[PDB]
Amino acid sequence: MKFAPNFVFGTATSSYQIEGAHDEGGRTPSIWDTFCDTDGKVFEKHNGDVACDHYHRFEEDIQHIKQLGVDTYRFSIAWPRIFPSKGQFNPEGMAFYKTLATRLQEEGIKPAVTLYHWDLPMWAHEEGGWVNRDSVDWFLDFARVCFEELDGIVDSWITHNEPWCAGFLSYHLGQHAPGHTDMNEAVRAVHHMLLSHGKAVEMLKGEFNSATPIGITLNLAPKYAKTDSINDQIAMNNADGYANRWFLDPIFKGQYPVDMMNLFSKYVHTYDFIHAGDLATISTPCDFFGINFYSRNLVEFSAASDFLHKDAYSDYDKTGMGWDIAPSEFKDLIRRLRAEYTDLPIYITENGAAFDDQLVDGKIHDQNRIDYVAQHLQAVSDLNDEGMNIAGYYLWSLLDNFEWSFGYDKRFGIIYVDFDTQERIWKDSAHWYANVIQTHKA
Amino acid sequence: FAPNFVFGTATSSYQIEGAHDEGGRTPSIWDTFCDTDGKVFEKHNGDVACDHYHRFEEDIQHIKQLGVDTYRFSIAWPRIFPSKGQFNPEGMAFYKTLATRLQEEGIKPAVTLYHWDLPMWAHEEGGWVNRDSVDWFLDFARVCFEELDGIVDSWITHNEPWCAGFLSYHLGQHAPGHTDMNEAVRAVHHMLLSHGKAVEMLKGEFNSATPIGITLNLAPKYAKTDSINDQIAMNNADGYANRWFLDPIFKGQYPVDMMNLFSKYVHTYDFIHAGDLATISTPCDFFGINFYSRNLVEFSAASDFLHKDAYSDYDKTGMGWDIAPSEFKDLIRRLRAEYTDLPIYITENGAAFDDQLVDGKIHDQNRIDYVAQHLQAVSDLNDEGMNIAGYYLWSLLDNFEWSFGYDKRFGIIYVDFDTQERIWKDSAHWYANVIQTHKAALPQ
Amino acid sequence: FAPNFVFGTATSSYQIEGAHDEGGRTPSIWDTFCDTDGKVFEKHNGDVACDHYHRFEEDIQHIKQLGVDTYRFSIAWPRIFPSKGQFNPEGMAFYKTLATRLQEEGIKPAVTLYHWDLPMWAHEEGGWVNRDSVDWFLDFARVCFEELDGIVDSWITHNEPWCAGFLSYHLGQHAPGHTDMNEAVRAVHHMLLSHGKAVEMLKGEFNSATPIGITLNLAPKYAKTDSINDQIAMNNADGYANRWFLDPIFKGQYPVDMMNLFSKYVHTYDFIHAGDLATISTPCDFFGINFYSRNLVEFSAASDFLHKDAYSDYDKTGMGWDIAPSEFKDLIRRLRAEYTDLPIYITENGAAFDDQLVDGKIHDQNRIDYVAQHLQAVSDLNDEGMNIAGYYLWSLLDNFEWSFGYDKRFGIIYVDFDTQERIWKDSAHWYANVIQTHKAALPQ
Amino acid sequence: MKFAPNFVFGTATSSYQIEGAHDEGGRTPSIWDTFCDTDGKVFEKHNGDVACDHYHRFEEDIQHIKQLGVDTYRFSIAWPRIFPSKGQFNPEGMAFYKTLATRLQEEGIKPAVTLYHWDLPMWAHEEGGWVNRDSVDWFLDFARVCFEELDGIVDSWITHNEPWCAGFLSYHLGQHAPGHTDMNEAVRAVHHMLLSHGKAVEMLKGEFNSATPIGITLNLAPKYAKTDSINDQIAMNNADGYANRWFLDPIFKGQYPVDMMNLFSKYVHTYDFIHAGDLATISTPCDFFGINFYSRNLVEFSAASDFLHKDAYSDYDKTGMGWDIAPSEFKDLIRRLRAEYTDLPIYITENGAAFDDQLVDGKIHDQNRIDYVAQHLQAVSDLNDEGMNIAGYYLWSLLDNFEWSFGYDKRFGIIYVDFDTQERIWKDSAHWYANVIQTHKA
C-alpha cells in the first residue's frame, strides 16, 4: 500500500443525511422530508429532522475531520436551504456553507462540494420535479448562486451524486424519493440531471471563467454473468446498460446506448425529450471523474423480466447491507473505464460499508469495516501501479447517518453517532484510517 | 354452526413426512430445489421434516385428541410412482394404512392428490409444461382411486395451482423456480385439465360417488384509491391471482382481459385444445378454498401487469400478511354471486407467528385470535346462507414452510425439530375446546 | 318500410365544399395533410372539391329531385372559428342559408358537427390529444346551436371517432397522420367527452329537444376458424374497431380487455377523469351507424393486438371491401341484444366502384345492387322489430375520398372534377324511384 | 467503366422461378408449390408449374447464356428434386444438374451454384421446417450429395440465398412461403439457415477436402434516417439491424447484435436456441461474400411500431417494383462493409430491376433497365478504383420468371419470355449487356 505524495485521502457526507435543523434557517422541506412521512417508504418512518445535528455541531465535526488528517472533506449543499421557495434566495442558508468552507480552508482541508445529493425542494417536485425540463434551469439558478458565493473557497465541485439513484431508483423502481414507478419519468429525470450537469459545467468555465475542478459522480456496479450461456450474456449486458452505460455513454461519448433505448422501448415510445445539443452539453469536458463504488452484481437471465435479468446467487462475503465485498471487480471496473471511456483523473468519491456495529465499553471494534476499506485501498494502490491514475479516495462516511430507505438502521460511519445524545465516538476504523493517512505522509 | 359442519386440520406430504429416500421414495422437485443455492431459507429441506412417515400413529392420536371430524393430508406422488410407469406398493401401503387407521378412529380422511411434490423424472421431461403431465397425473390418480376410494371420505385433486403454476414457473419462488410466463400458463393449464380428467375418471370409469373437488388459494384484491388506474390495478391483480383459475373451473373459459395482458409474454394460446375447458369445468361435489389474506394494490406504469402492492395499515401475521376476516366475507359472497352454489370447504386457513416455547408451553394467543376471527366469519356467513360445510385449520403441526423452511410456524402443535417432540400450543387446546363446545350445542 | 322511415343522402364539408380560403376559412389538418408528401393520392386536395360552397343551389335541386326526406351534411369548423375564439359570421351565414333553403324545400337537415376538419390552430396546440379540445369543440357547437338549432332537424356530434382517433393518430393514414397509440386513446377520449358535453349543453343549457346522437362506424369481426387463437383475434379486432367506442357511449366504461392490450403502449389511463364516462354516456335520442363492411380475421403471434386480416372470398367493392349485408344484420341484432334500444339511423352506407362515363351515362348496376341488398336487409331487420328509423346513402356526389383523393367514387351523382358538371348515375335514378315506390305504398 | 481482366460478368436464376416440370423427374412439392395454392398469398394464384420450362429447355438457355458471353451462370438446385422424400435420394434429379453443369463447363461457362434458394420440401415443412433444429441436418444431407456428385464440375458454391427473405419475410412478415407471422419462429429459422451454412462450409473444406470457393449470399438494403432527430436515428439503426446486422454480425463477428436481441425481446423471451459453438460455426471462414443488392430504404420513427420504424416518403426515381434506384447508397454499403465487416472478395450475386416491359414488333426497348444496370456497373467500377475488390457482378435475371408473391406480373429478365408459348426474345438490355462484356474483353 503506497500512494503518490499527490494522492488525496478524504471522507464524505451529504446534507440531508447529517445536518438536521430541517425547519431552521429558512429551510423548507425536500422530497425526502415528505417521503419519510409517506407510509411504507422509509424504515420506521425515520427522517432527517435531527439526523447528526451537524447544522448546529459543525465545529465539532470539523475537529473530527482535522484529527483524521484527511486532505479533503466531501459534503453537499442543501438546495432547500438556498432556494426554499422558487426564485427566493436565502442568505442565511448560504452563510452556513460559506462559514463551513471558510473554516475548512483555515484548517487546511480541501472542501469537495456536491451540489445535488438528492434533496430536491418540494416546490420543484410540485412542478413535476426532474421530469420537467425546467428542472435544468432551477438547478442552474442553484448552481449559479453557489458559484457566486463559494467558488473562491471551494477546492472542487461535483455537480450530481448518483443519477442512477436519483433517476432510476427514485422514479422507476420507487425505492427512493419521490417513489415513482414510471420508466418514462425515469429516463426524463436522468436526462435532465445529466443535462443540468453539463450546463452547470459550461456556466462555471464560461461565464464564471473559473478553473475550479469540476465533475460528475456516478455509482458504478460492475455486472457478471452467472454462466457463459448466451442468455446470461444478454442479462449481464442489460444489467450493465441499466446501471452503468446509460450514464457513462452520454457523459463520455455524447450518446445513449441504443441497445438500452430499444429494451426501454417496452415503456418508452419516444425519445424526443432528448433535444439537439443536449448530448454535446452532457459530454462537456470536465476535470475529473467521480466514482461511487460499493459492489458488483452477479446476474442471470429471466424470460419473465422486461429487462431480461434478475439477480443470481452470490457466494461472496457480504456487508451488513447484503452486498458483495468485491475488490477484484473494483479493479475490473477501473481498467474497463480506462480501456473504453476516459483518461481523466478518477476520484473514488465514495467507498465504504455498513456492518452491525457493536458498542462495548465506549469502543467499536469494527475490524470488518477496516478489512473492507483496506482491501479497496490496496486495490487503488495496485491500480495506481498499473497507471490507472486514481487521484484520491473519499471514505463513506465520516459519521453514521440517515441511510435513506433504511433510516438509522444502517451505519456506514468510521465515527459512531448516538442519535439520542449526539455523542461522536471514533470507531477502530477511524483510528486506523487516521494512521494510514499519517503513514502515507512520511 | 350447523349440525353437519365439519372441523378439520391439514398437512401435506413433503412438509411433514420425512423418510425422503425410504420406502422406495425418489426425489421431488422440492428435494432438489432445497438443495439449489439461494432458493430455500438456509437450505432447509424435507429429509426429516416432522418424521411423520415414522411417527404417524402418534400424530393420529394427536388428531384424535383434538376431536376434529376431518384430517386433510396429501399423497406423495414420488412414493407411488418413484419412476415413470413403475407403481410402488410399499408407498401405497403407507397411505392405505394411514386412511384405515383414521377411519378406525372415526376421523374422515380428506385427501389431496397433488400438493406440489412432482417427481424429478416428470420434471426432467418438462414437468407441468409438458401436456403429457396430464397422463402422468392420471396414472397417479388412477392407482390412488383403485386402492383408496373405499377408505377416503373426500378427494381434492389439486392444491393451489396459482402456487404450483405461477409462483413456481413465473415468479420463480417455488419449485422448480422458473421465471417464464409461457411455461407458467402451460403449467396451470395442464394442472387444471389434469383435475378435470381425474374427476371424469372417478365418476365415469370408477363410477364412484366419493365427493371430489379442487382447492384454490384465493386472495381478494382491493384498490388503494378509486382512480381508474387503481381500478385497472385491482382488476389485473384479481385476474392474476383468482379469475385465471375461477373462470376455467366454473365458466369453462379463460378471461380474455388477462389473455391480452399476458400476451406481453405469451404469443400463442394453442396449448388450449378443443375439449380442454369443458373437461376443466366438469361438475364437482364441493369447492375448496385456501384463504389467508387480501392484498391492497395500486397502479404502476412500470409494471407489465399494471399493479404493485400498496401500503397496508392492517394488523399482520408473522408472514407480514394482512389479518383480513372482512375481506374473507367479501370473497365468499362474491363467489356465491358470480361463480358457484357448491358447498365450500375452507381447506386451509391459519397463521404464522413468532412462537416462543416457555416452560414447556406456547402462549399463541395471537394465533387463537386469528383463527377465532375467521371461525366467527364462517359462522356469520353461514347465517347468510353461504353454505360453508367445513373449516380445516392449517396446520396440525409446525412443518416445512416451503421457501421459508422451518423459520415459519403455522402449527397448532409445536414441533421441536431437533427432537421431534410434539407440544400442544395454547391454540391446540383452545381449538379442541371450540369443537367440544360446538358438539355440546347439538342435540344427541 | 314503415310510414315514418326516412330516406337520405350524405356528404361532409371538406369532401365537397371547396372555396378553401374564401369566406374567412383558414386551413384544416386535412389541407396541410394533402400537401404532405406521401399522404394523399397524387397530393389531391379539397381546394375545389365539388365547389359546393358556390354551387349549393344546384345541389339542393339535385337533392330535391332525388325525393329524399333527409340531407345529411357537416359544418366546417375552420369556417366558424378560423382562429381560436374568433367567430366568423360569414361562415355561419352559409350554413344558416343552406339549412333555411333545405327547409323551404321540405328537406330535413341532419347536421354533423365534426367530420374531421380540425382547424390547424387547434392542431398546433396538440389537437385532440389536448384535453382543451373539449372546450374548443364546445365553443364551436355552442354557436352552431345558437344560430341553427331552430332550423336543423337533427344533430350528429361526431362522425367516426375510430377514424378521427385511431386511423388518424395510431395508424397514421388520416390527418394529422400520427402513429402513437397514447395520442390516439387521448384523442378518442376527448372526442367522446366532447360529444357528451355537447349533448348536455343542448339539452341542459339550450333546453332544446332537437334529436341528437353520435355516429360510429362499426365493422363486425369474424374468426377465420373456431380455434381459441382466432377467437382471441376476433375479440381484439372487435374491441379495437367497435367496443372501444360502444362501451363508453352505452355502458359508461372502457373495456378492460382492450385497456390491458393497449398497455403495450399506454402506461397510464389518468387522462380519464372523474365524471368523463358519465358524460360520455349521457342519454341521446338516436344512434347513428356508418356501415360498410365486415372483416374476417385470424391470429398473429407477431402482432401487438394478436390479429391480422384473413383471406376473404366475398364479392368486393372497388375499395376491396367485402359486400356483407348478412353481417350488417348480425351487427344490428347484436346492438339490440347487448347495447341499445335507441332508434338507429344508418347515417352512411354506400360503395365505390370503377365508374365509367359512356355517352353521358354511368351504368353503375354494381352500386345499385350493393345498395339494394342493404336496403333489403334494413327492411328485413325492421320486420324483426330492429327499429332502423332511416338510411342515408353515402354519397350524393362523387367527392374527395380522403387519402384516396378523387380516385374513388362513392357518389350516386357523377362529378367531372375538371368541369364540375353533375351527371346522375343509373343509381341516382334508381334511388329516386325506390323512394317514390315507398311513398306510393303509403296511404295519403 | 473499366473492369480488371479478372472481373467476372454473370447472370442469375433460381430453380423454382424457371424450371417448371414441377411433378416430373421424381420432384415432390415445395413450400412454394403449396403457398401458391393458398388463397391470398400469390398474385392470381400464379405458380411455378411451368414457369420458363427450363427443365425441358435448358439446352436453348445454355445457348442464350453462351451468346451473352458471360463468364458465369448462377443457378440453384431444387432440393425437392434431390430429396423428394426424407432420406430418399433421387438420381434422376441429380442427373439434370450434373448434365447442366457439365454442359456449361463444355461451353467454357463457370457454374455458380446456389444450394438453398427457397424451395424447401413439403416433408421438411411438415416437421416444422427451418424452425426445427433438425433442418440443419436435412440441409447437410442435401449439401453432401450435391458436393459428392457436383463439386468437380462446379466453379463456386453459394450455401444460402437471402436468409432475410427465407427467414423474416417468410416466418415473421408472412409474405413468403410458408407465410407465418411469428417472431420466435423467424429467429429460429434464420439461426438454423446460418448454422446450416456454416456446417456445409466445414463439411466441404474438412471431410471433402475441397478448395472450391464457397460463401453465403445476403440481400443488404442500406437504411437512411429521414431527419437528424434522435428518434429517426433509432429508427435507421433498427431498420438496419432487422435487414442487415442480424445477418452480418453472426457471419463475420460470430455474434448477434444485442440491440436487436433486446428489441426482438418484445416477442422472443429466450435465446437458448443458440447453442454453444453455433456462432463459431456460422462465422466459419469462407472464400467470398455474396451480395444481392436492389435498393435502399429511407425510414423514420414510429412510437406505435414494435421495432420503432416505418418507411418514409422517398422522392427518388423508382423501378416498377416501386423500389428506389439507389447507386450512391450501393457505394455507401460496400464502403461500410470494408470498413466494418470484411476484406473478402465480394460478388454481386444479384442486381437488376423490374420495369413495365412493352413488346412492340418483336423488340423490347428497355432503356430504363439498361440505365439501371449501367449505373450499378459504373458504381462497381468506381468502387474497384477505390480498392473495394468487387470480383464480379451477376445480373438478375437471365429470364423473366416467377417473381414470388408477385407471380409473372413482374419481369426482371434481360431476355423476355412469353409464358404461353415459351418463346425467348432478347430485350435491348440483353444486346447491351452482351456488348458491355465484349468491350471489357478487348
Q: What are phi and psi of A314, to 5 degrees?
A: -110, 130
Residue positions counted in chain D = 442
Q: Between the CA of residue C13 and those of C23, C44, C400, C411, what are the distances in Å?
A: 14, 16, 10, 15
A-chain residues near B303 (CB < 8 A): 181
User: Strands (DSSP E) along C395-434, which ranges?
Assistant: 413-416, 421-424
Q: Given an 8 Å threshold on Cβ–Cβ distance, is A276 in contact with D304? A: no
| Cis status, amide bond into C395, omega within 30 of 0 | yes
Distance of alpha carbon A174 from alpha carbon A190, whole angstroms:
14
**All 3 cell numbers of residue A37?**
412521512
Burial environment of residue B206 by CB neighbours within 10 A (0 to 12, 13 to 18, 19 or more):
middle
Q: Which residues lie across from C309 on neighbouring strands?
A: C297
Cell numbers placing A92: 442565511
Q: Are D267 and D180 in contact (CB under 8 A)?
A: no
- Contact state of D313 with C38 under an 8 Å Cβ cutoff: yes
Q: What is the largest CA-CA distance in chain D?
A: 62
A276 and D231: CB-CB below 8 Å? Answer: no
Q: Between the CA of residue B176 and those of B17, B29, B118, B179, D283, what are the distances in Å?
A: 20, 6, 9, 10, 36
User: Helix (H, G, I), strand (E, B), or coil: what is residue B156?
Assistant: strand
Interface of A with B in 260-279 (CB under 8 A): 267
Q: Which residues pair with D360 in a beta bridge?
A: D363
Run of H or E residues at B95? helix B89-104
Grid cell for residue D403: 417473381
Q: How far apart, in whole angstroms, are the C-alpha atoms of residue C357 and residue D425?
A: 39
Whether chain C has a CB inside 8 Å of the CB on D132: the answer is: no
Q: In angstroms, rounded to a whole number, what is the distance separating the alpha carbons of residues C40 and D291?
A: 35
The grid coordinates listed for D303 are: 412510437
Residue type, D291: I
| Helices vs strands, H then E, count in chain D | 17, 15
Number of helices followed by number of strands (H, E) in chain C? 17, 15
Q: Which residues contact A189 (CB under 8 A, 6 or more apart)?
A: A129, A130, A131, A166, A167, A170, A171
C264 CA: distance to closest CA in chain D (Å): 9
Cell readout for C149 is: 338549432
Q: Nine-digit cell at A50? A: 435531527
Mutate to test the interface with C, among D43, D306, D308, D405 (most CBs of C within 10 A): D306
What sign results for the dihedral spanned by CA atoms C144, C150, C152, C153?
Answer: positive
Asked if D210 and D151 count as a contact pair (C-beta separation under 8 A), the reply is yes
Grid cell locating D31: 413450400
User: What is the separation of C-alpha C287 from the centre of its chain, rounded to a whole number of angstroms?
Assistant: 12
The backbone torsions φ and ψ at residue C131, rounded to the nearest 5 degrees and listed phi first, read -60, -25
What's the CA gap between C291 and C393, in Å, rounded? Answer: 11
Q: Which residues of A are tagged catalytic?
A: 162, 350
The closest of C102, C100, C108, C78 to C90, measured between CA atoms, is C78
CA distance D393 to D380: 8
Do the chains contact at B179 and A302, CB–CB below 8 Å? Answer: yes
**CB-CB under 8 Å, A263 with D266:** no
Nearest to B46 by CA among B95, B79, B77, B13: B13
Instruction: Judge: C267–B301 Cβ closer than 8 Å, yes or no.
Output: yes
Query: Which residues 168-207 of chain C have a CB within 8 Å of chain D?
Result: 170-172, 179-184
By DSSP bridging, strand C421-424 and strand C413-416 are antiparallel
Answer whether A313 sits within 8 Å of B37, measured CB to CB: yes
The minimal CB distance from A262 to the residues D259, D271, D276 is found for: D259
H or E element: which one contains D439? Answer: helix D428-441
Chain D residues with CB-CB distance to C263 below 8 A: none
**Considering only alpha carbons, which residue of chain C is nearest residue B306?**
C267
Amino acid at C396: L
Could you count the other beta carbons within 10 Å of the beta carbon of residue A344?
A: 18
What is the Cα–Cα distance from A73 to A110, expressed in whole angstroms?
Answer: 6
Residue pair A160/A197 in contact (Cβ under 8 Å)? The answer is yes
Alpha helices in B179-324 (DSSP H): 181-200, 228-238, 244-246, 256-262, 276-280
Check: CB of residue D325 under 8 Å from CB of residue D291. Answer: no
CATH code given to domain C1-444: 3.20.20.80
Cα D224 from Cα D235, distance rounded (Å):
9
Neighbour-count burial for C408-431, b at 16+ CB within 10 Å, e otherwise: bbbbbbbbebeebebebbbbbebb
Distance CA D10, CA C422 (A): 59
Amino acid at A102: T
Q: Please count the residues of chain A.
A: 442
Residues of C in contact with B259 (CB under 8 A): 232
Chains that contact D by 3+ CB pairs under 8 Å?
Answer: A, B, C
Span between the terminal Cα atoms of chain C, in Å: 15
What lies within 8 Å, CB to CB, of B440 at 6+ separation is none
Determine the Cα–Cα distance for residues A197 and A142; give it in Å rounded to an integer: 12
Q: Do B235 and C228 lie within an 8 Å CB cutoff?
A: no
CA distance A103 to A108: 9
Of C150, C108, C156, nearest to C8 (Cα)? C108
Supply the residues of B annotated as catalytic. Answer: 160, 348
Using alpha carbons, select from D371, D352, D365 the residue that is nearest to residue D410.
Answer: D352
Phi/psi of residue B344, each to 5°?
A: -105, 130
Q: A214-251 burial, b if ≥16 CB within 10 A, otherwise e?
A: bbbbbbbbbbbbbeebbbbbbbbbbbbbbbbbbbbbbb
| Annotated catalytic residue C22 | no
Residues of A in contact with C264 (CB under 8 A): 266
> Residue D184 is nearest to which of B181, B264, B267, comparing CB atoms?
B267
Computed on alpha carbons and rounded to an integer, the radius of gyration of chain A in Å comes to 21
Beta-sheet strand order (sheet of D297-301) = D223-225, D297-301, D309-311
Q: CA-CA distance, D70 to D414, in Å (whole number)? A: 13
Task: Note whether A401 and A52 are within 8 A (CB).
Answer: yes
The one-letter amino acid code at A81 reads R
Please say if C348 is a catalytic residue.
yes
Left (φ > 0), alpha (ψ -120 to 50) or beta: where does C275 sit? left
Task: Give contacts of A184 with chain B, Cβ < 8 Å.
Answer: 301
- Please state, in angstroms and as integers, the Cα–Cα distance from residue C45 to each residue in B183, C21, C168, following that order: 54, 13, 17
- Inter-chain touch D306–C311, beta carbons under 8 Å: no
C171 and D315 within 8 Å at the Cβ level: the answer is: no
- Cα dihedral: A242, A244, A248, A250 (round 10): 10
Length of chain C: 444
Contact partners for chain B, using 3 or more CB pairs closer than 8 A, are A, C, D
* φ, ψ at A69 (rounded to 5°): 80, 10
Least Cα separation, residue D281 to chain B (angstroms): 29
Q: Do residues D332 and D222 lie in contact, with contact meaning Cβ atoms separated by under 8 Å?
A: yes
Q: How far apart are CA A223 and CA A233, in angstroms?
A: 10
B390 three-state secondary structure: strand
Query: How many residues does this entry show for chain B?
Result: 444
Cβ contact B265–D269 (<8 Å)? yes
Give a three-class secondary structure readout of chain A.
CCCCCCCEEEEECCHHHHCCCCCCCCCCCEHHHHHHHCCCCCHHHCCCCCCCCHHHHHHHHHHHHHHHCCCEEEEECCHHHHCCECCECCHHHHHHHHHHHHHHHHCCCEEEEEEECCCCEHHHHHCCHHHCCCHHHHHHHHHHHHHHHHCCCCCEEEEEECHHHHHHHHHCCCCCCCCCCCHHHHHHHHHHHHHHHHHHHHHHHCCCCCCCCEEEEEECCCEEECCCCHHHHHHHHHHHHHHHHHHHHHHHHCCCCHHHHHHHCCCCCCCCCCCCCHHHHHCCCCCCEEEECCCCEEEEECCCCCCCEEECCCCCCECCCCCECCHHHHHHHHHHHHHHCCCCCEEEEEECCCCCCCEECCEECCHHHHHHHHHHHHHHHHHHHCCCCEEEEEEECCECCCCHHHHHHCCCCCEEECCCCCCEEECHHHHHHHHHHHHHHC
Per the CB < 8 A criterion, the answer to whether D378 and D2 are in contact is no
Q: Based on C-alpha coordinates, what's the Rg of chain D?
A: 21
User: SS3 of D262, please?
Assistant: helix
Helix (H, G, I), strand (E, B) or coil at C213: strand
**Cα D309 from Cα D233, distance rounded (Å):** 10
Beta strands C6-10 and A297-301, pairing class? unpaired
Question: Contact, D214 vs D159, CB < 8 A?
Answer: yes
Q: Give the whole-angstrom CA distance, residue D1 versus residue D379.
A: 9
User: What is d(CA A277, CA A288) in angstroms, rounded to the nearest whole number?
Assistant: 22
User: What b/e readout covers B179-195, taking b as 16+ CB neighbours within 10 angstroms?
Assistant: bbbbbbbbbbbbbbbbb
Residue at grid coordinates 455458380: D112
- Cβ distance A112 to A72 under 8 Å? yes
Q: Single out the residue of B136, B251, B269, B241 nearest to residue B198, CA to CA.
A: B136
**Nearest CA-CA partner of A119 in A36, A37, A30:** A30
Query: Taking the domains of chain A in order of start, what are their residue ranges?
Result: 1-442
Partner-chain residue, chosen from C229, C259, C270, that has the shortest CB–CB distance to B268 = C229
For residues B190 and B183, is the Cβ–Cβ distance under 8 A?
no
Among C202, C212, C290, C279, CA closest to C248: C279
Residue type, D5: P
User: Which of A131, A170, A175, A181 is the best residue to mutate to test the B interface, defined by the most B CB atoms within 10 Å of its own CB?
Assistant: A181
- Amino acid occupying residue D58: F
Give CATH superfamily name and number for A1-442. Glycosidases (3.20.20.80)
3-state SS, residue B293? coil
Of these residues, D19, D300, D350, D403, which one is catalytic?
A: D350
Scanning A302-331 for CB atoms below 8 A from D yields 303-304, 308
Q: How far apart are the CA of A224 and the nearest CA of chain D, in angstroms?
A: 16
Tell me how close the Cα of B400 comes to any Cα of chain A, in angstroms: 22
Per the CB < 8 A criterion, the answer to whether D26 and D115 are in contact is: no
How far is Cα D14 from Cα A64, in angstroms, rounded to an integer?
84
Resolution of the experimental model, in Å, one decimal: 2.2
Contact (CB, 8 A) for B367 and B310: no
* Cα angle, residue D317 at apex, residues D314 and D319 outer, rounded to 5°: 105
Please report the sign of the dihedral spanned by the C-alpha atoms of residue D327, residue D328, residue D334, residue D337: negative
Give the whole-angstrom CA distance, residue B296 versus residue B224: 6
D122: contact with A, CB 8 A cutoff:
no
How large is the greatest C-alpha to C-alpha distance in chain C, in angstroms?
62
Q: What is the rounded CA–CA span in Å between residue B327 and residue B133?
A: 35
Compute and round to an integer the Cα radius of gyration of chain B. Answer: 21
Q: CA-to-CA distance for B165 and B195, rounded, in angstroms?
A: 14
Distance of CA C363 to the CA centre of its chain: 27
Q: Do C265 and A270 touch (CB under 8 A)?
A: no
**Technique of determination:** X-ray
Q: List, in sequence order, every residue forming a beta bridge with A147; answer none if it has no partner.
A: none
H or E element, residue D279: helix D278-282
Cell of C97: 342559408
